[PDB]
Structures are given as C-alpha cells and as structure tokens.
DNA sequence: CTGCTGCTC
DNA sequence: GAGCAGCAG
C-alpha cells in the first residue's frame, strides 16, 4: 500500500533522491536523470549481452557482442505520447542500430531494433532543436526492417 | 532511516518514484511526469514569491509577478556533478522574459543559492551551442560577481 | 510540428 | 566548452 505517502510531506516526499541514490548504488542508474533512460540501457544491457558506453556523446549507448555501436526509451503508463529522446547529428552514422523500449509508469510493453536506416524514413527534422525527430507509434511498428524483442 | 528501502526490488523501487511522483502531482507540487525539481521549483518560486504560472511554458517565461513582469524559472541540483549550467534558452534573442530566476538545490532540494538574474545580464554572458540551437549559461564566477545579479 | 525540463564529461 | 536523458501540448 503506497498511501501512507499522504502522511509526508513535500519536503519528505527527499525520500525520491534516497530512491535515486539506492537505485544509483545498486548499478541500475548512472546519471541523476529520469530514472526510465538509465534502467533501459541496465535492462537491454544485461540481457542481450552488451558493455554500455558512459560516452553516449553524439553517439551510441552500447556495442553488441558483434561490434556494433546501439543507440538506448519512453514510459507511457498522463498524455499517451512515444516521441522518442531527440538524436542529433545523425547523417554520420552513429550508430549500426537502435534499441527503443516502452514502459508503463515501469514494466515492460513494446521493445524494436532499428537499422540507423530506417531512421531516416522515419524521422523529421526540426531547426528549433536541430535534431531529428521520431516518434514510435504505428508505422515504423510494422516495418519488416525493424525487429521486436 | 531510509534502510528499509533495500527490502525492494528493482521494479518495486521504480514503482514507488513513479507513485511519489504521481503524490506531489496530486497536490499541485508538479505538473509533469519529468523531473520533481523543475516543477517542485517553479512551484517554490511563485507559491513563495506571489506569482502566476504559466504551463503554456513556450514563450521562455514560466511565471508572472506581482508587478506583472514575465520571469523565466530555471533550477538545477548540484551535489559535489557540481557543474551549474542551465537548461537551454533555446529563444532568448526575443527575450520573453524581464528577469530570470536560478534556485540551486542540494540532494534533499534544498536551497543553497537562488539569484533573480536579469535578461541583459543574461546576455552578457550566454553562449550558444550550434549542436541544440541554444544558448547557454552558467552561474559560476564573474556571473555570481555581477553587480547586476541579487540573490 | 510546435514546445518543455533537468543532467554529464 | 562539448556533450545527454526523458517529457508536454
Ligand atoms: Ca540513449
Ligand atoms: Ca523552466
């Protein structure tokens, strides 16, 4: 039961920073960022074998066991929206593929593999950011070129 | 005594940010799933200061005065990563905004400095970063120095 | 397609 | 100074 919450306070509601540092401590977080962004990466890292890269710099998140760099997600349980995070510098192939994760505020529900090709056709760009935009909702879902994990 | 956290698993622990998170939204201490600090702050700066929020935050201000001036609201933790560089002002060149506030907090959001920094001010030590689109500033040195800058 | 917030090396 | 993450309308 999570309502004995009421009895604190806002100054008490602290208590999400200890979370933050038990989470931190623990290796599933880096960064005292969303905590979504830094448990994909722990999560696809883990799983499918892959030495993450503190160095996401305009550049990949991880390497598979093949060599090849991967780019690291969005967690819809108020406003339904899957735009992914922004990716900038992309015409220099950054990246040999994509791996973008759901999460529902934070179990698991869709997860793809995106060639940095599929981006492209996928993807628009905006002057304001300078960055390419992409959401992850209805087409790209079914490019055979993507995959689901 | 926060040791009874360790009793919980991985999704336990990011159920129950969430939920905090969805607690504070519930009374009116943020208006977004993103960041507590951001929101927890704006809402500081105008529930304390006498002002209006603005969650239509586009024109670059986040809050009106008592006097009815537009004010940019910007905070960041810093918890000796130490480096204090403000989120983007990714429009400032129209300036829609009279005089901003940076409220820096500590690991249990307190206030170690706020400054009510001015827009002019505010140009004379931005920089812009080609990659975002946006300008940039930090409060660190000749900033803090300014004799246009009060806390 | 228009916007936001905070954070790291 | 270069970079980063997720999030809202
Ligand atoms: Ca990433
Ligand atoms: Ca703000």
Redesign the interface.
């Given at each position: 039961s999570?309502d004995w919450?009421?009895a604190l306070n806002?100054?008490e509601?602290?208590?999400?920073?200890?979370?933050?540092?038990?989470?931190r401590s623990?290796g599933?977080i880096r960064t005292?960022?969303?905590?979504?962004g830094d448990?994909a990466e722990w999560l696809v890292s883990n799983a499918l074998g892959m030495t993450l890269l503190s160095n996401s710099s305009?550049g990949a998140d991880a390497i598979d066991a093949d060599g090849l760099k991967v780019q690291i997600a969005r967690?819809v349980?108020?406003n339904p929206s899957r735009q992914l995070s922004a990716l900038?510098?992309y015409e220099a192939a950054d990246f040999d593929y994509l791996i973008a994760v759901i999460f529902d505020?934070?179990?698991i529900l869709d997860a793809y593999k995106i060639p940095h090709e599929v981006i492209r056709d996928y993807a628009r760009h905006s002057?304001?950011?300078?960055?390419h935009i992409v959401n992850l909702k209805g087409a790209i879902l079914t490019d055979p070129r993507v995959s689901s994990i």
């Open positions: 999570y919450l009421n806002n100054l509601l602290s208590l999400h920073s200890e979370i933050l540092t038990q989470l623990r599933v005292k960022n969303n905590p979504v448990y305009a967690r349980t108020d900038r510098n505020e934070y179990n002057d304001h950011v300078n960055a």
